[PDB]
């Protein structure tokens, strides 16, 4: 089968304007208007407001294309819109072909008869989603309560696009994925899947083929499964009748090289190569498809305090270190593989087991799931429903089930995908008071019947789980299932309160923090708006009372500041500490609490929000805290009623021997505690390592600390405790003494020592890839923390600045 | 009967020390230790911590006194401890006399036999309440959950003394009221009461006498009721038998001059003068006792949304403008009539209908209730139980009923006292989760049986009401009964949220604010602690996260400041605005809501807290906002989706005619849609006066306003609205133009005009009694706001300063 793809440039105009302007085909209306200069950068200042009219208008896209006489020879031609932003009417040579209800799925159309030779005309009328949805809600028996934007629920589109806590109202339409014209003769591989049927010292496997035959024809399927070198090969023959045929073909892989997530093994991926072909030897459809071999179990077994909730890949239980993933741009077609690659490798090296693809953005581009596959980053896939009362009439349930079929059928092969999730927050929402005392949980049947059944039907390999918080009697309970901890941010509770949360799996929690100055500067329109509570700063904070929350949190541990640059450093470290102090505690429980998923990995535009990496892909400082908090092997401190209580954590398949040091030094002076001999941390477990009573501690002159050494020279982790908020600590300004070695042409090695306790030193260098940063430096220790700068020159990396809570600097 | 009173100086020492030091008799241990120089001022800095040992020690007080041969002639001598701080053993001439369990009642003891002529020795062993209570709790079948300090509950003492949200842990012991030796021959008036039996164009009344006769003897009672030309006089004669005799003597008062609260009438008080008299003509006991003549009804009648909760004095329903009253010092004997007089006259002139004597301090000194009587300030009297699980065994219930009898018997006569209340917050507490998941509501029987019955027994004149929040299903409901709104402060919700609270009576709500600088300076120990989040500033804020709340609220409407002095002005106006915006809204409902009681009128020590007048009696600025919010006749503004909605409120018995002005001016320019109509506000009611569509408003350059003129074209109230937080208002710095007339010797009259909108101008003058300030001044208006300074000279009143949010120049 041959593919003429209609990607490239199209012409487009408002439903009723005269001019046809130029447009790009994986596109948005907004993009094309930006490119033609017709509307300002919505991401800048208060331009969101300027551009609300786009949303309200209907739109027409049109391409003219040239088709051969050769090409019409193909006995069937179907037109395939890989993705399309919701509501559309699509005409070919001035004749209808179908509506589209849906952004999240492919739409395919039979056109052989309507096609003519030479020039052709494809016309796509894109309806204002605002207008279309508010009609659909007006027509509906009841009124349904969303959030910001209620009628959102009545259509199948990216729920964030109408505005969120961290997104803006850029409700874009557009042909948001490839448009292919496909021509084929006799038959076509329709789907291919390679489920592991059951596993052991040897691996049993099926190959599930859908095939759509038009004539009743003899066919040969021939395949080769390959790891590095081809492990297996086979040919088979069928004589099948016209229609959709399905086959499960068993086969065996001896000594299977088994997929594991990062840190618990290797990311072995088999490749399947399969050619459908004719009786005459002529190939009809090929398909490469990659897959892994792995068990997944969602261990849900009762105990004292409630019920477990733990992932078990290949029978090893992994604590899920992670973060919630959200669309990387408000206009989706600008995200390039470059971008996904950068955010995901940054996750990898921060030490991330898992990403929850949050059910309010989208089902991702294949590039996302195929990197997650390679990098060992398991994913928690939500079905795209979030924080609202959805419709639940038959007409709708069919649309939903139709999409669920497609989505699963697409993503099934990715060994990274570890769970299917029904929704975000709805069961919690109805069970709590938000959206009222209604008897009908509006949407329940989607979560209860529709989805579990389509999941059970098409994918035995993975657990379905009906809701993003679904912890027992009160869906957010700490006894059963997973938990969303918004006590801390949204309720205002001090972030130390994460210590009193013992939920079986924290799938959501976070703290806000404004981006790096560079990023800030790109969206503020003036230097007069560069102050913490400016119109443009609060306007770029879509959380109801976000800035005053940030300012609250800063004011827990710190002296308030009116200085913009101080505020940024201070607020961003608070973010680190909130995340740190939570992440550390959940890990200290280990399998009582078998998971921590940070509430924001990325941003979809330049905004003050929970994200640990901003829209322009510039690491918040909290990223380095999160790397630290995820260190595969780690020591944490944790109070208990006037007695401190250190911990030891292995996220590794092998027991660890190594020395710890306690202490309780002053900010100058020298320790008041016991250096320890060898300690063991057993494989894949948290262990209590030490106690240390403190019934006469000088809270404002002293601080308890811990350092962890592996069997070699090396510092592998450290940690500290303070007994009073930083602002009251009689903490002398330190002086730090750094120097810079060069290990390989662009790799460097940074050496630091400090007199007194210096805190959160901030290594600034325009394009560096720091292995660690925003660091505490203790008296009596010298630190060798490596980096690189594949940008700057050998003498110019000594134009490196650095700052901290308490400083003077030297060399 | 003759009274030798043992007030004066006593000797005292720790249970086991050798030195006897000097002491004062209405006293505290702490006081006497302070006075002897043995311990620092607990109110200064972090001295609270220094003085915790006092609490733990047992104490001995001793007086030696001289008694005549003439005095023993009296056939019965009883010793009367008017008040004593809890747990004591009391010896006379080295022989026991009784324990005391109770601070809140008089203790009386028969001593004629134990007395000797000449020198005598009274010895009072005062037990450490800390030690005594924790014993009592340890002995108890179950553990009971208080708050800060749990075992608090097992004793009868001032619950605040063990520390609160705004108080510190100064758990003082001491002989806290007068000690009288009483000698009498034959009989004594034991109690006297003058209940109004029923009322009308004429007034029917009883006189209830208890009398304790020792011999069976003929007696004459003779009385004169006086208004104060004596309206009535009478003599009666009885021949009664030994024991406690009781009599209800009916009489009638023609055309009674009727007590009303301030604003709704006159505070007429009759005086009763009654002499119990022998057969010879010799007086045995006199009683002077004051009383009022008034109905009180607590209207609790169902309607659409829930059930009313409205006070009706003499059939007129009064909206209770008010505040919660709490003990005026941590050590009670220092409060002098001077102090009560100052705090209560300041309440009067702020325009206060009511004070709730909060059930965690004490039953007040007679001076409090007799001023409340004179000044027309109705009181809501709590029985002293607050925010805890109290014991409910027989042994305890008897102690409780014994105290309730005494308390009521004492306070019954005061026409100010308008309600008896069971507790503070307990029904709410058990119904909510705090101390929750207990089947036994741990003091219910106190609230359900004990107290209502003793109230019903001894006082038909007043409603009993079982709990300080006692709604319906959920005791804090807005549908029924009264309500405590801690959404705003304690939950963190923006103070604009008071607009969405429609509770039938708001008995509690508040916002914190640090005191005046002068006051601050008295307790801070250094100028280095004079910054908003210093150790000593947070230490003098006993609310868990008080400072960071304050800083959150400031950061709602304003730019944060690192400056101590700014912070004070800004935070204190926030307090005004929180209180204002609530008080105004509750009044706009009028009898749907029927009451607003501010959470803090006063302080018991120098502290950052809700109080509207600080420990040293220096008005917070919010006092002037509260006066403004209480203006008997008033116009308020109140948003509605897309349109503003002005209101009109009469707390007066007569309809009001007068002109209002709308507007929507810029901060300079006076422009839009000046709509300048007459209007009527009917007597004792809220009425909607105007609407005003806010179509296309410049939120950052403009502000809607209202002014109210009486028939004389005098300004009597004004009000304003803003559409964005002050910090973003393009608001020019104003310049004000003031000058000072003299009305009478020490009275003055201050004239102001301003170019642009000046906000919250701050009239500073060392001893002035401002009739208004912290005032907004509009463009085209000249203000004559009167004051006085009975301290300074007329030419020295022109050493008056002033400041505001925006002030380039003055005069
Ligand atoms: O309340 C905080 C958070 O609650 C839920 C999340 O899915 C976010 O949309 C939001 O930021
Ligand atoms: O949570 C705030 C409040 O709770 C209770 C009240 O009686 C107040 O004393 C306190 O401030």
Task: Check if B654 contacts A (Cβ < 8 Å).
Answer: no
Q: Are the Cβ atoms of B531 and A559 closer than 8 angstroms? A: yes
Residues A306 and A405 in one domain: yes
> Between vectors from CA B709 to CA B703 and to CA B714, what angle results, nearest 5°?
115
* Atom from ligand 1 closest to the CA of residue A166: 11
Tokens representing B102? 């109770």
Secondary structure letter of residue B315 according to DSSP: T
Q: Look at residues A630, A657, A691 and tell me which one is the last residue of a structural domain.
A: A630
| A494 contact residues in B (CB cutoff 8 A) | 545
Q: Which of A533, A561, A727 sits opposite B727 (nearest CB)?
A: A533
Residues B311 and B390 in one domain: yes
Secondary structure letter of residue B767 according to DSSP: T
From residue A361, alpha-carbon distances to A146, A159, A166, A380, A446 in Å are 15, 6, 12, 14, 18
d(CA B740, CA B752): 9
* Segment holding B105, helix H or strand E: none
CB A792 within 8 A of CB A766: yes
Closest B-chain CA to A537: B728
Residue nearest to atom 11 of ligand 2 (CA): B165
The C-alpha of B635 sits at a distance from chain A's nearest C-alpha, in angstroms, of 30
d(CA A159, CA A137): 15
* Segment holding B174, helix H or strand E: none
d(CA B218, CA B278): 7
Residues B650 and B582 in one domain: no
Strand segments, DSSP code E, in A396-470 are: 417-421, 464-465
Q: How far out from the chain centre does Cα B581 lie? A: 22
| Three-state secondary structure readout of B506-566 | EEEECCCECCCHHHHHHHCCCCCCCCCCCHHHHHCCCCCCHHHHHHHHHHHHCCCCCCHHH
CB A61 within 8 A of CB A131: no
Q: Which residues 83-112 of B are in CB contact (within 8 Å) with A?
A: none
Tokens representing A327? 């669309």
Residues B119 and B237 in one domain: no
d(CA A33, CA A23): 8
CB A202 within 8 A of CB A196: no
Ligand nearest to the CA of B358: 2
Q: Which of A535, A552, A559 sits opposite B552 (nearest CB)?
A: A552
Task: Check if B116 contacts A (Cβ < 8 Å).
Answer: no
Ligand nearest to the CA of A358: 1
* Segment holding A402, helix H or strand E: helix A394-411
Q: Are the Cβ atoms of A552 and B547 closer than 8 angstroms? A: no
| Three-state secondary structure readout of A367-391 | HHHHHHHHHCCEEEEECCCECCCCC
Residues A318 and A444 in one domain: yes
Top mutation candidate among B490, B603, B609 for ligand 2, by most atoms within 8 Å of CB: B490
Beta strands at A736-742 and B807-810: parallel, antiparallel or unpaired: unpaired
Residues B588 and B526 in one domain: yes
Strand segments, DSSP code E, in B592-684 are: 595-598, 633-636, 639-640, 643-650, 656-661, 664-666, 678-681
Interface test with B, best of A488, A489, A548 (most B CBs within 10 A): A548
| Residue among B5, B410, B385, B380 nearest B192 (CA) | B410
CB A766 within 8 A of CB A791: yes
Task: Check if A545 contacts B (Cβ < 8 Å).
Answer: yes
Tokens representing B694? 């806010």
Q: How far out from the chain centre does Cα A378 lie? A: 10
Ligand nearest to the CA of A607: 1
> In B676-692, which positions are buried (b, 16+ CB within 10 angstroms) versus exposed (e)?
eeebebeebbbeebbeb
Q: How far out from the chain centre does Cα A648 lie? A: 28
Q: The dihedral of CA B614, B618, B622, B624: what is its sign? A: positive
Verify whether ligand 1 is closer than 6 Å to residue A424 (CB atom). yes
The C-alpha of B54 sits at a distance from chain A's nearest C-alpha, in angstroms, of 22
Task: Check if A533 contacts B (Cβ < 8 Å).
Answer: yes
* Atom from ligand 1 closest to the CA of residue A490: 1
Secondary structure letter of residue B386 according to DSSP: B
Secondary structure letter of residue B487 according to DSSP: T
Residues A409 and A538 in one domain: yes
For residue B223, give its domain range: 186-292
d(CA A101, CA A99): 7
* Atom from ligand 2 closest to the CA of residue B489: 2
Per DSSP, the residues of A45-101 read TTHHHHTHHHHHS-EEEEEEEEE-HHHHTSSEEEEEES---S-EEEEESS-EEEEE-
| Residue among B756, B781, B660 nearest B701 (CA) | B756
Q: Which residues 485-514 of A are in CB contact (within 8 Å) with B?
A: 491-492, 494
Residue B561 CB contacts under 8 Å (≥ 6 apart), including other chains:
A560, A562, B554, B567, B570
Q: Which residues 676-715 of A are in CB contact (within 8 Å) with B?
A: none
Q: Are the Cβ atoms of A548 and B556 closer than 8 angstroms? A: yes
Task: Check if A548 contacts B (Cβ < 8 Å).
Answer: yes
Q: How far out from the chain centre does Cα A214 lie? A: 41
| A548 contact residues in B (CB cutoff 8 A) | 552, 555-556
Q: Are the Cβ atoms of A555 and B562 closer than 8 angstroms? A: no
Work out the widest C-alpha separation in chain B, in whole angstroms.
92
Task: Check if A552 contacts B (Cβ < 8 Å).
Answer: yes
How many secondary structure helices (H) and strands (E) does chain B include? 16, 46
d(CA B547, CA B534): 10
Residues with CB under 6 A from ligand 2: B 165, 387, 424, 486, 490, 599
Count up the domains in chain B and report the number: 5
Phi, psi of A597 (to 5 degrees): -115, 110
- How far apart are the CA of A374 and the centre of ligand 1, in A? 29
Closest A-chain CA to B546: A556
Residue nearest to atom 4 of ligand 1 (CA): A486
Q: Residue B122 sits in a domain of what CATH number?
A: 2.60.120.260
| B552 contact residues in A (CB cutoff 8 A) | 492, 548-549, 551-552, 555
From residue A175, alpha-carbon distances to A86, B38, B152 in Å are 9, 84, 70
| Residue among A550, A740, A519, A684 nearest A618 (CA) | A519
Q: Are the Cβ atoms of A728 and B535 closer than 8 angstroms? A: yes
From residue B24, alpha-carbon distances to A72, B15, B30, B161, B182 in Å are 113, 18, 11, 20, 20
Q: Which of A491, A548, A727 sits opposite B533 (nearest CB)?
A: A727
Residue A609 bridge partners (DSSP): A513
Q: Look at residues A630, A659, A684 and tell me which one is the last residue of a structural domain.
A: A630
* Segment holding A657, helix H or strand E: strand A656-661
Residue A63 bridge partners (DSSP): A122
d(CA B158, CA A243): 87
Task: Check if B555 contacts A (Cβ < 8 Å).
Answer: yes
d(CA A99, CA A84): 11
CB A716 within 8 A of CB A741: no
Task: Check if B562 contacts A (Cβ < 8 Å).
Answer: yes
d(CA B632, CA B629): 9
Q: Residue A299 sits in a domain of what CATH number?
A: 3.20.20.80
Closest B-chain CA to A728: B535
Residue A180 bridge partners (DSSP): A5, A80
Residues B758 and B769 in one domain: yes
Q: Are the Cβ atoms of A556 and B545 closer than 8 angstroms? A: yes
| Residue among B86, B99, B80 nearest B130 (CA) | B86
Tokens representing B783? 């203000």
Verify whether ligand 1 is closer than 6 Å to residue A21 (CB atom). no
Residues A389 and A433 in one domain: yes
The C-alpha of A619 sits at a distance from chain B's nearest C-alpha, in angstroms, of 27
- How far apart are the CA of B807 and the centre of ligand 1, in A? 42
Beta strands at A187-193 and A203-213: parallel, antiparallel or unpaired: antiparallel
Q: Look at residues B160, B185, B210 and tell me which one is the last residue of a structural domain.
A: B185
Beta strands at A483-484 and A506-508: parallel, antiparallel or unpaired: parallel
d(CA B261, CA B651): 11
Q: How many CB atoms lie within 10 A of CB A768?
A: 19
Secondary structure letter of residue A254 according to DSSP: S
How many secondary structure helices (H) and strands (E) does chain A include? 16, 45
Virtual torsion, Cα A475, A479, A481, A486, nearest 10 deg: 60
Residue A356 CB contacts under 8 Å (≥ 6 apart), including other chains:
A322, A323, A324, A325, A379, A380, A382, A421, A468, A507, A508, A597
* Segment holding B246, helix H or strand E: strand B243-253
Closest A-chain CA to B729: A535
d(CA A629, CA A482): 20
Closest A-chain CA to B550: A552
- How far apart are the CA of B436 and the centre of ligand 2, in A? 18
> Between vectors from CA B810 to CA B804 and to CA B811, what angle results, nearest 5°?
140
Residue A92 bridge partners (DSSP): A122
Residues A528 and A546 in one domain: yes
> Between vectors from CA A124 to CA A122 and to CA A128, what angle results, nearest 5°?
170
Tokens representing B134? 């924790």
Residue B770 CB contacts under 8 Å (≥ 6 apart), including other chains:
B624, B763, B785, B787
Task: Check if B547 contacts A (Cβ < 8 Å).
Answer: yes
Residue A322 bridge partners (DSSP): A354, A597
Q: The dihedral of CA A669, A673, A679, A684: what is its sign? A: negative
| A574 contact residues in B (CB cutoff 8 A) | none
Query: What SS3 class is residue A343?
Result: helix
Residue A303 CB contacts under 8 Å (≥ 6 apart), including other chains:
none
Tokens representing B558? 């304003």
d(CA B162, CA A619): 50
Q: The dihedral of CA B86, B92, B94, B97: what is its sign? A: negative
> In A400-428, which positions are buried (b, 16+ CB within 10 angstroms) versus exposed (e)?
bbebbebbbbbbbbbbbbbbbbbbbbbbb
| Residue among B412, B513, B408, B390 nearest B452 (CA) | B408
Residue nearest to atom 2 of ligand 2 (CA): B490
Residues A648 and A612 in one domain: no
- How far apart are the CA of B165 and the centre of ligand 2, in A? 7
From residue B389, alpha-carbon distances to A320, A324, A743, B392, B444 in Å are 43, 43, 68, 9, 9
d(CA A589, CA A686): 7
* Residue keyed to tokens 């601070």: B103
CB A705 within 8 A of CB A697: no
Query: What SS3 class is residue A582?
Result: helix
CB B195 within 8 A of CB B251: no
| Residue among A498, A467, A463 nearest A480 (CA) | A467
Size of chain A, expressed as the number of residues it contains:
811
d(CA B697, CA B666): 10
* Atom from ligand 1 closest to the CA of residue A468: 7
Residues B193 and B69 in one domain: no
């Amino acid at each position: 089968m041959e593919i003429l793809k209609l990607d490239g440039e199209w012409e487009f105009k408002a439903v009723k304007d005269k001019k046809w302007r130029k447009a790009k085909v994986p596109g948005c209306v907004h993009l094309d208007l930006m490119e033609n200069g017709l509307i300002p950068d919505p991401f800048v200042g208060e331009n969101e407001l300027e551009v609300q009219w786009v949303e309200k208008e209907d739109w027409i896209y049109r391409k003219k294309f040239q088709v051969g006489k050769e090409f019409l020879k193909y006995s069937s031609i179907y037109l395939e819109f890989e993705g399309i932003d919701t509501f559309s009417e699509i005409y070919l040579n001035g004749k209808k072909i179908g509506e589209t209800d849906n952004m999240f799925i492919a739409w395919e159309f039979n056109v052989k008869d309507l096609l003519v030779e030479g020039e052709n005309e494809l016309e796509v009328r894109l309806f204002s989603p605002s207008k279309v949805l508010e009609e659909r809600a007006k027509n509906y028996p009841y009124k349904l309560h969303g959030g910001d934007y209620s009628p959102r629920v009545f259509g199948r589109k990216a729920q964030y696009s109408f505005g969120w806590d961290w997104g803006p109202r850029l409700a874009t339409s557009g042909i948001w994925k490839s448009v292919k014209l496909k021509g084929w003769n006799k038959a076509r591989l329709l789907d291919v899947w390679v489920p592991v049927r059951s596993l052991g010292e040897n691996a049993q496997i099926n190959i599930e083929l859908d095939i759509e035959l038009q004539e009743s024809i003899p066919v040969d399927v021939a395949f080769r499964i390959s790891h590095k070198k081809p492990v297996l090969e086979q040919r088979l023959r069928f004589t099948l009748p016209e229609g959709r045929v399905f086959l499960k073909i068993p086969l065996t892989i001896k000594n299977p090289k088994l997929w594991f997530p990062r840190g618990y093994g290797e990311q072995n991926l088999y490749t399947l190569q399969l050619v459908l072909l004719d009786e005459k030897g002529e190939v009809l459809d090929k398909v490469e498809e990659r897959f892994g071999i792995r068990k997944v179990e969602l261990f849900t077994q009762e105990d004292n305090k409630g019920e477990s909730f733990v992932f078990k890949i290949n029978n090893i239980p992994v604590f899920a270190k992670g973060a919630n993933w959200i669309p990387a741009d408000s206009f989706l077609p600008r995200i390039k593989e470059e971008d996904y690659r950068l955010l995901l490798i940054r996750a990898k090296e921060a030490g991330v087991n898992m990403l929850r693809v949050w059910g309010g953005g989208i089902y991702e581009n294949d590039i996302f799931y195929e990197l997650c596959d390679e990098l060992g980053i398991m994913v928690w896939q939500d079905f795209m429903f979030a924080c609202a009362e959805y419709p639940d009439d038959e007409n709708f349930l069919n649309d939903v089930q139709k999409e669920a079929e497609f989505v699963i059928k697409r993503l099934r092969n990715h060994p990274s995908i570890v769970l299917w999730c029904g929704n975000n927050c709805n069961h919690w929402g109805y069970y709590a008071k938000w959206w009222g005392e209604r008897e009908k949980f509006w949407g329940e049947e989607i979560y209860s019947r529709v989805l579990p059944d389509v999941c059970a039907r098409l994918d035995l390999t993975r657990p379905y789980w009906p809701s993003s918080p679904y912890g027992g009697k009160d869906p957010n309970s700490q006894e059963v299932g997973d938990r969303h901890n918004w006590e801390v941010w949204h309720g205002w509770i001090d972030f130390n309160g994460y210590l009193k949360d013992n939920g079986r799996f924290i799938s959501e929690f976070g703290m806000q923090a404004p981006p790096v100055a560079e990023t800030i500067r790109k969206f503020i329109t003036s230097e007069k708006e560069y102050y913490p509570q400016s119109r443009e700063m609060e306007f770029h904070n879509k959380a109801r009372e976000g800035t005053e929350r940030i300012i609250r949190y800063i004011a827990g541990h710190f002296k308030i500041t009116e200085d913009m640059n101080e505020y940024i450093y201070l607020s961003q470290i608070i973010q680190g500490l909130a995340l740190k102090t939570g992440i550390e505690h959940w890990r200290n429980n280990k399998f009582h609490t078998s998971g921590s998923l940070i509430w924001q990995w990325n941003d979809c535009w330049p905004v003050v929000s929970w994200s640990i990496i901003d829209y322009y892909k510039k690491l918040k400082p909290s990223y380095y805290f999160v790397k630290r908090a995820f260190r595969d092997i780690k020591v944490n401190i944790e109070p208990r009623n006037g007695k401190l209580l250190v911990f030891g954590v292995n996220d590794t398949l092998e027991k660890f021997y190594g020395k710890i040091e306690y202490a309780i030094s002053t900010f100058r002076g020298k320790r008041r505690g016991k250096k320890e001999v060898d300690i063991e941390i057993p494989a894949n477990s948290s262990v209590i390592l030490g106690e240390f009573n403190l019934e006469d501690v000088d809270k404002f002159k002293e601080f308890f600390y811990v350092q962890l050494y592996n069997e070699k020279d090396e510092l592998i982790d450290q940690n500290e405790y303070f007994f009073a908020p930083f602002r009251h600590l009689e903490l002398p300004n330190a002086v730090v003494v750094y120097s810079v070695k060069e290990i390989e042409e662009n790799s460097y090695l940074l050496n630091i020592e400090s007199d007194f306790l210096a805190l959160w030193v901030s290594l600034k260098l325009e394009n560096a890839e720091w292995e660690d940063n925003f660091v505490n430096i203790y008296p009596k220790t010298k630190y060798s923390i490596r980096f690189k700068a594949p940008y700057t020159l050998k003498e110019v990396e000594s134009k490196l600045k650095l700052e901290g809570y308490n400083l003077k600097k030297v060399i």
